[PDB]
Structures are given as C-alpha cells and as structure tokens.
Design an enzyme around this catalytic site. Structure first.
Site, PDB file in Angstrom:
ATOM      1  N   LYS A 145      -1.903   0.314 -10.022  1.00 24.53           N
ATOM      2  CA  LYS A 145      -2.009   1.171  -8.844  1.00 24.53           C
ATOM      3  C   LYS A 145      -3.384   1.829  -8.733  1.00 24.53           C
ATOM      4  O   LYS A 145      -3.762   2.647  -9.581  1.00 24.53           O
ATOM      5  CB  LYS A 145      -0.924   2.251  -8.885  1.00 24.53           C
ATOM      6  CG  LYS A 145      -1.112   3.373  -7.872  1.00 24.53           C
ATOM      7  CD  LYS A 145      -0.101   4.488  -8.098  1.00 24.53           C
ATOM      8  CE  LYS A 145       1.270   4.136  -7.540  1.00 24.53           C
ATOM      9  NZ  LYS A 145       1.259   4.117  -6.048  1.00 24.53           N
ATOM     10  N   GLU A 169       4.905  -0.336 -15.754  1.00 17.54           N
ATOM     11  CA  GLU A 169       5.637  -1.534 -16.150  1.00 17.54           C
ATOM     12  C   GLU A 169       5.978  -2.226 -14.828  1.00 17.54           C
ATOM     13  O   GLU A 169       6.037  -1.584 -13.783  1.00 17.54           O
ATOM     14  CB  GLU A 169       6.922  -1.188 -16.926  1.00 17.54           C
ATOM     15  CG  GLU A 169       8.076  -0.681 -16.086  1.00 17.54           C
ATOM     16  CD  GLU A 169       9.354  -0.465 -16.896  1.00 17.54           C
ATOM     17  OE1 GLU A 169       9.928  -1.453 -17.401  1.00 17.54           O
ATOM     18  OE2 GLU A 169       9.787   0.696 -17.028  1.00 17.54           O
ATOM     19  N   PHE A 170       6.191  -3.532 -14.874  1.00 17.59           N
ATOM     20  CA  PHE A 170       6.473  -4.295 -13.664  1.00 17.59           C
ATOM     21  C   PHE A 170       7.918  -4.766 -13.555  1.00 17.59           C
ATOM     22  O   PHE A 170       8.485  -5.263 -14.526  1.00 17.59           O
ATOM     23  CB  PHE A 170       5.544  -5.516 -13.619  1.00 17.59           C
ATOM     24  CG  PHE A 170       5.770  -6.415 -12.432  1.00 17.59           C
ATOM     25  CD1 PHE A 170       5.203  -6.115 -11.194  1.00 17.59           C
ATOM     26  CD2 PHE A 170       6.564  -7.553 -12.549  1.00 17.59           C
ATOM     27  CE1 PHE A 170       5.425  -6.937 -10.087  1.00 17.59           C
ATOM     28  CE2 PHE A 170       6.794  -8.382 -11.447  1.00 17.59           C
ATOM     29  CZ  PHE A 170       6.222  -8.073 -10.213  1.00 17.59           C
ATOM     30  N   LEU A 171       8.504  -4.600 -12.369  1.00 16.87           N
ATOM     31  CA  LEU A 171       9.870  -5.056 -12.086  1.00 16.87           C
ATOM     32  C   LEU A 171       9.718  -5.950 -10.857  1.00 16.87           C
ATOM     33  O   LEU A 171       8.907  -5.656  -9.978  1.00 16.87           O
ATOM     34  CB  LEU A 171      10.815  -3.879 -11.797  1.00 16.87           C
ATOM     35  CG  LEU A 171      11.391  -3.146 -13.022  1.00 16.87           C
ATOM     36  CD1 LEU A 171      10.447  -2.041 -13.461  1.00 16.87           C
ATOM     37  CD2 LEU A 171      12.754  -2.549 -12.678  1.00 16.87           C
ATOM     38  N   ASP A 193       9.476  12.033  -3.011  1.00 16.76           N
ATOM     39  CA  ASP A 193       9.404  10.994  -1.984  1.00 16.76           C
ATOM     40  C   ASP A 193      10.299   9.783  -2.218  1.00 16.76           C
ATOM     41  O   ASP A 193       9.864   8.638  -2.079  1.00 16.76           O
ATOM     42  CB  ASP A 193       7.951  10.541  -1.805  1.00 16.76           C
ATOM     43  CG  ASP A 193       7.770   9.628  -0.601  1.00 16.76           C
ATOM     44  OD1 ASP A 193       8.241   9.983   0.503  1.00 16.76           O
ATOM     45  OD2 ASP A 193       7.156   8.555  -0.755  1.00 16.76           O
ATOM     46  N   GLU A 218       0.831  -1.196   0.000  1.00 12.84           N
ATOM     47  CA  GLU A 218       0.000   0.000   0.000  1.00 12.84           C
ATOM     48  C   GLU A 218       0.868   1.249   0.000  1.00 12.84           C
ATOM     49  O   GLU A 218       1.396   1.648   1.037  1.00 12.84           O
ATOM     50  CB  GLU A 218      -0.912   0.010   1.228  1.00 12.84           C
ATOM     51  CG  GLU A 218      -1.836  -1.192   1.311  1.00 12.84           C
ATOM     52  CD  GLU A 218      -2.841  -1.075   2.433  1.00 12.84           C
ATOM     53  OE1 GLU A 218      -2.810  -0.060   3.161  1.00 12.84           O
ATOM     54  OE2 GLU A 218      -3.663  -2.005   2.589  1.00 12.84           O
ATOM     55  N   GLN A 276      12.155   1.714  -1.185  1.00 17.39           N
ATOM     56  CA  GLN A 276      10.943   1.051  -1.659  1.00 17.39           C
ATOM     57  C   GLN A 276      10.497   1.523  -3.049  1.00 17.39           C
ATOM     58  O   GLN A 276       9.770   0.813  -3.742  1.00 17.39           O
ATOM     59  CB  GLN A 276       9.786   1.283  -0.674  1.00 17.39           C
ATOM     60  CG  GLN A 276       9.954   0.687   0.724  1.00 17.39           C
ATOM     61  CD  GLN A 276      11.096   1.303   1.531  1.00 17.39           C
ATOM     62  OE1 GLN A 276      11.417   2.484   1.389  1.00 17.39           O
ATOM     63  NE2 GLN A 276      11.698   0.500   2.400  1.00 17.39           N
TER      64      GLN A 276
HETATM   65  O1  LIG Z   1       6.799  -2.948 -10.561  1.00 15.61           O
HETATM   66  C1  LIG Z   1       6.382  -1.872 -10.126  1.00 15.61           C
HETATM   67  N1  LIG Z   1       6.082  -0.757 -10.839  1.00 15.61           N
HETATM   68  C2  LIG Z   1       5.670   0.243  -9.991  1.00 15.61           C
HETATM   69  C3  LIG Z   1       5.241   1.621 -10.302  1.00 15.61           C
HETATM   70  C4  LIG Z   1       4.751   2.496  -9.199  1.00 15.61           C
HETATM   71  C5  LIG Z   1       4.719   1.997  -7.795  1.00 15.61           C
HETATM   72  C6  LIG Z   1       5.193   0.618  -7.484  1.00 15.61           C
HETATM   73  C7  LIG Z   1       5.666  -0.241  -8.612  1.00 15.61           C
HETATM   74  C8  LIG Z   1       6.166  -1.594  -8.647  1.00 15.61           C
HETATM   75  C9  LIG Z   1       6.421  -2.441  -7.636  1.00 15.61           C
HETATM   76  N2  LIG Z   1       7.162  -3.718  -7.786  1.00 15.61           N
HETATM   77  C10 LIG Z   1       7.701  -4.451  -6.787  1.00 15.61           C
HETATM   78  C11 LIG Z   1       7.845  -5.892  -7.080  1.00 15.61           C
HETATM   79  C12 LIG Z   1       8.424  -6.791  -6.065  1.00 15.61           C
HETATM   80  C13 LIG Z   1       8.860  -6.238  -4.763  1.00 15.61           C
HETATM   81  S1  LIG Z   1       9.542  -7.289  -3.508  1.00 15.61           S
HETATM   82  O2  LIG Z   1       9.831  -8.595  -4.029  1.00 15.61           O
HETATM   83  O3  LIG Z   1      10.625  -6.545  -2.950  1.00 15.61           O
HETATM   84  N3  LIG Z   1       8.366  -7.484  -2.333  1.00 15.61           N
HETATM   85  C14 LIG Z   1       7.083  -8.236  -2.557  1.00 15.61           C
HETATM   86  N4  LIG Z   1       6.898  -9.325  -3.361  1.00 15.61           N
HETATM   87  C15 LIG Z   1       5.609  -9.803  -3.392  1.00 15.61           C
HETATM   88  C16 LIG Z   1       4.742  -9.026  -2.604  1.00 15.61           C
HETATM   89  S2  LIG Z   1       5.622  -7.825  -1.792  1.00 15.61           S
HETATM   90  C17 LIG Z   1       8.685  -4.801  -4.445  1.00 15.61           C
HETATM   91  C18 LIG Z   1       8.140  -3.907  -5.450  1.00 15.61           C
END
Ligand SMILES: O=C1Nc2ccccc2/C1=C/Nc1ccc(S(=O)(=O)Nc2nccs2)cc1
Length: 282
Positions: free
Chosen positions: A33, A74-76, A120, A12, A124
């Site tokens: 999001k 996009e997803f990382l 910000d 969140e 994270q």
């Molecule tokens: O991939 C992402 N694109 C974004 C754009 C805006 C805000 C957030 C994101 C975002 C977040 N990805 C992400 C993926 C894995 C992890 S983690 O492996 O460190 N932790 C977790 N893994 C599964 C649930 S919580 C943390 C952030």
C-alpha cells in the site's frame, strides 16, 4: 520499494493505491500500500504492527524511505464485496453469514479492547480466504492519518459528533450484516443528507426520548422531517428473530446503548455457529 515487483493493482483505497506484489528477497506475495510524513503517523502505524489477531489482516512491514510511506500487509485473494456479487443469485448461506459475522466481531472485540477503531468498515475492507476465514483490513489507518461511500457511516458521525467511539464500527457491521442477508445495501445514500434521511425513514427520526442529546448535535436541524420507525420484519425479511434482535441492538441510535462486539459474541444468534468452507472461484 525496488525490493518489490508489482504484479497487479488491487484498487485505490482512501489512503492510497494497493498493489499485489512479490518480495524479491523472500518471494512471498503481499499487499503493498503506497500512502498518499508527520512523526505522529509513523508512531501510530508502528503500534498497529503489534496488533496481531487471526481475524485482522497482519501489518508485516512499514517502509519509510525517501520521505515516502509504504505499508506491507499479508495478502488475501478476495474481498466480501466480490464474494457477494458472485453469490447474488442464491445469496450467501446463513451458516456462512453467521460464521463471518462471528469472526468479524471477534476481530473488533480484540481491536476495541486495544482502543483501536476502524472507522471505515465496508465490504471492500473485509477479506476472505479458502479456509473459511474473514479478516478486517485497513484497521486504525483512519486515525493514523485523517466518490466516497457513506452507506455504512454511523448517525453520530453524520450529525457532526467529532469524538466518535468504538460504537461506529458496530453500526457499520450491522449495515453489512443486513446487506449479506438481503443482498441489497441497507442505506445507499448518495450524499450526507440523503444518507441521514434514508436512515431516518427506516429507523425513524430520532428524538430526545430514544437518543438523549441528539438535538444538541452540531449538524442537527429542528427542520428535519419526522418519519416513523419501520418494522424490522420488513427491513431484513428472511432473518429469524434471533438475527433481527441482534441487528436491532447493533443499529441503536444512541451510541451508548448500541451493543459492544464483546456482548454481541454472547448473543443467542451465535449459539449454533459453525465454520463452513466457502466455494471460492479465484
Ligand atoms: O490482501 C490485502 N491486504 C490488504 C491490507 C490493506 C488494504 C487492502 C488489502 C488487500 C486486498 N486484497 C484483495 C485481493 C483480491 C480482491 S478481488 O478479487 O475481489 N478484486 C480484484 N482482483 C484483482 C484486481 S481487483 C480484493 C481485495
């Protein structure tokens, strides 16, 4: 909305919950999001969609339906906070720290040149992939809209300056830089005043000599205790002189004297920068 299948919740954020989702149509995996809409935000967000750079998490689509706002990014697979935790025993190799900082500065230099600030920055919000790249996430959302970690907040923000600049992002990056090196938060305040004082106790209480106008800040109090500046070799021990020199310019009190992302890219610290591939456990 119904065009996306939630797979897991990624956390969140400040402006809403983030989910890993699959686009029913395409089949692509993305970061969905959910925000929480004024037209001001809609236009602001629209501009970010055009902000394309290899070190900035791409904003793929903006969905404004049923008076609800969904941002598709996009997803990382991993953020820097989790990577640091996983490396707590041996620490992150200096070549990798240098590569990450170099890329982050390229990203900020690009954003700042477009007059867009993050506001910000924190571990994270920094995402990494298997290829050795690192990207800034949630850029420009603070302005588009409006227990929170204060650890990376710049002094001018804590003192009540309401018209902050690109310099606040350089300060946050400097704090993150220190954290990767020592494996411990630099200024882990648990309240606004505690945050300010932890900064003061390390960098010394600021005065008119080092920060002209500081005593006219809205939240400045003459009653602030006066602590002496501590030496950097004590603050981030292992860091060589090039690194400590760069860090000191990123942490200057006066926003106007603080180094820009552009000038930092030419600093001697990056003379031998490379792009190592990290070992990631997904
Ligand atoms: O991939 C992402 N694109 C974004 C754009 C805006 C805000 C957030 C994101 C975002 C977040 N990805 C992400 C993926 C894995 C992890 S983690 O492996 O460190 N932790 C977790 N893994 C599964 C649930 S919580 C943390 C952030």
């Amino acid at each position: 909305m119904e065009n996306f299948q939630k797979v897991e919740k990624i956390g969140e954020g400040t402006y809403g919950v983030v989910y890993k989702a699959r686009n029913k149509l395409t089949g692509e995996v993305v970061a969905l999001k959910k925000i929480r809409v004024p037209s001001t935000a809609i236009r602001e967000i629209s501009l970010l969609k055009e902000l394309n750079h290899p070190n900035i998490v791409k904003l793929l689509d903006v969905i404004h339906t049923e008076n609800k706002l969904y941002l598709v990014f996009e997803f990382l697979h991993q953020d820097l906070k989790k990577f640091m935790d996983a490396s707590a025993l041996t620490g992150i190799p200096l070549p990798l720290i240098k590569s990450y900082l170099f890329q982050l500065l390229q990203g900020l230099a690009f954003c700042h040149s477009h007059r867009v600030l993050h506001r910000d920055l924190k571990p994270q919000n920094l995402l990494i992939n298997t290829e050795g790249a690192i990207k800034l996430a949630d850029f420009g959302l603070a302005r588009a809209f409006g227990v929170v970690t204060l650890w990376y907040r710049a002094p001018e923000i804590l003192l009540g300056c309401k018209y902050y600049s690109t310099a606040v992002d350089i300060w946050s990056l400097g704090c993150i830089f220190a954290e990767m090196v020592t494996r411990r938060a630099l200024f882990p305040g648990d309240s606004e005043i505690d945050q300010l004082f932890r900064i003061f106790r390390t960098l010394g209480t600021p005065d008119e000599v080092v920060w002209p106008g500081v005593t006219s800040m809205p939240d400045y109090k003459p009653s602030f205790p006066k602590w002496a500046r501590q030496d950097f070799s004590k603050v981030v021990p292992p860091l060589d002189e090039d690194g400590r020199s760069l860090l000191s310019q990123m942490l200057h009190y006066d926003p106007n004297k603080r180094i820009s992302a552009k000038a930092a890219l030419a600093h001697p610290f990056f003379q031998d920068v490379t792009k190592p591939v990290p070992h990631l456990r997904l």
